């Protein structure tokens, strides 16, 4: 039976697959993984020091759903509200360097590749492990 | 039979006084799984009477100005606090809700146009819609002022308000204004 | 040819638009052509809103001006040298008309 990423809770799934990159450490992490401030509208840089792995888990899942996306599309997805303080809050996109770095990070693992159109999409093997993990979390979640 | 939130069968609740048998809306006919339905229960008159009570309290709780689009949040506030009730007492949250409402529903009020002495001149009995209308309002206001700056949050802050109102102990903020309103009407009879 | 030609039209008033297009559609049928019916786009509404008063004195009243743009297009698979005359014998001075060739 199954198992795709659609039939598993994405909240638990993204946690599970982020553990996979933590377990199989090959995703090249930039030097600044401790100091990015991570999506300018945000402050107080993320609590989890593995924030690059949960980000990498998250962007991999997102692309599997809506492929053919670039860096600018990634920054919009993770863009949150910027609280201007005394000025009313607005919407601001995430930092481009972190989304750029993770996008190339999946390239070094050969999960994603450039296409004839702008953006990159998961390769056959790239979405293969994503469904293996989706089955892994479901069986753990199911029982 | 309706397993509200997967529990709390409807067909055990009893309501004492004849007046709110017509009004209390916890009967199996309007036995909804959740307190959320945009059913136009305020577009006309007299429809809010048949609107389910569990919808009413979760709809009045959504009121301080800072939380006006939080219906799903108020559904979790009642659904959590209903657990605290059934956890503490073991009987039906639905039952104690109705006992809390009928106990905390003020009957006598004062309203007039002459020279009001203390509140108004003439003591006036309430209709059994404003009675249930007001009674929910004290409960909602009874959790709000307690949960404002306390460590305890609304789930228990509402919870202790109902059980105190249901038994009757003069320590709940809701029933504390109820009898006070009753006696001022008896004062200016 | 045989050419996959398309003819488009656009204006602000619709009563002429319905009749003038149907005139081209009926002209196509009497010419016995493989004719694609009138495909019609969502309308375009221009929403200029203005202060409504020349000076600054008023009760904060405004002026909501509208203009609707409706565009439709027909498609054919008939030779250009045998469809020019029909698209030319219908004028309707209130309308805008554009042509493009089979390969576009």
């Amino acid at each position: 039976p199954g198992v795709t990423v659609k039939d598993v809770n994405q909240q638990e799934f993204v946690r599970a697959l982020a553990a996979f990159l933590k377990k199989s450490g090959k995703l090249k992490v930039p030097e600044w993984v401790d100091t990015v401030k991570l999506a300018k509208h945000k402050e107080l840089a993320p609590y989890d020091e593995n924030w690059f792995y949960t980000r990498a888990a998250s962007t991999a899942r997102h692309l599997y759903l809506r492929g053919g996306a670039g860096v600018g599309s990634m920054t919009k997805i993770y863009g949150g509200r910027q609280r201007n303080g005394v000025m009313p809050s607005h919407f601001s996109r995430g930092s481009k360097s972190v989304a750029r770095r993770v996008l190339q990070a999946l390239e070094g693992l050969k999960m994603v590749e450039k296409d004839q159109d702008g953006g990159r999409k998961l390769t056959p093997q790239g979405q293969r492990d994503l469904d293996r993990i989706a089955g892994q979390v479901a069986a753990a979640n199911k029982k | 039979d309706i397993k509200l939130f997967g529990k709390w069968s409807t067909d055990d609740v009893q309501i004492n006084d004849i007046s709110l048998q017509d009004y209390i809306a916890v009967k199996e006919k309007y036995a909804k799984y959740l307190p959320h339905s945009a059913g136009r229960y305020a577009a006309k008159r007299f429809r809010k009477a048949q609107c389910p009570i569990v919808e009413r309290l979760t709809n009045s709780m959504m009121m301080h100005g800072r939380n006006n689009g939080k219906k799903l949040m108020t559904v979790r506030i009642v659904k959590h606090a209903f657990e605290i009730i059934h956890l503490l007492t073991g009987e039906n949250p639905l039952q104690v809700l109705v006992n809390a409402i009928i106990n905390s529903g003020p009957r006598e009020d004062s309203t007039r146009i002459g020279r009001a002495g203390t509140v108004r001149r003439q003591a006036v009995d309430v209709s059994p819609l404003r009675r249930v209308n007001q009674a929910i309002w004290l409960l909602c206001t009874g959790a709000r002022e307690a949960a404002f700056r306390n460590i305890k949050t609304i789930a228990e802050c509402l919870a202790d308000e109902l059980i105190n109102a249901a038994k009757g102990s003069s320590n709940s903020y809701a029933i504390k204004k109820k009898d006070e309103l009753e006696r001022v009407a008896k004062s200016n009879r | 040819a045989i050419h996959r030609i398309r003819i488009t039209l656009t204006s602000r008033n619709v009563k002429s638009l319905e009749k003038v297009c149907a005139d081209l559609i009926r002209g196509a049928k009497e010419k016995n052509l493989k004719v694609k019916g009138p495909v019609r786009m969502p309308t375009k509404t221009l929403r200029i809103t203005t202060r409504k008063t020349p000076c600054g004195e008023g009760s904060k009243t405004w002026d909501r001006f509208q203009m609707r743009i409706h565009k439709r297009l027909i498609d054919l698979h008939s030779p250009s040298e045998i469809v020019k005359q029909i698209t030319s014998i219908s004028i309707e001075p209130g309308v805008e008309v554009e042509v493009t060739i089979a390969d576009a």
Binding site: - | - | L46, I48, K52, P54, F65, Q66, M67
Partner: protein, 55 residues
């Protein structure tokens, strides 16, 4: 006069270059859809352009 400073200041970007196309005024302009008309004159000629007060 002379030609070196008569128009030395640039009528580039800004309110100086822009103006109404009827009254040469530089207040209450409407550049939307390239009108370049002030609000008073636009209300005056609105029917001729085709902006109709539908609702």
């Amino acid at each position: 006069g002379h030609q070196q400073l008569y128009w030395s200041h640039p009528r580039k970007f800004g309110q100086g270059s822009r103006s109404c196309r009827v009254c040469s005024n530089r207040h209450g302009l409407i550049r939307k859809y390239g009108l370049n008309m002030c609000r008073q004159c636009f209300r005056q000629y609105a029917k001729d352009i085709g902006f109709i007060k539908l609702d």
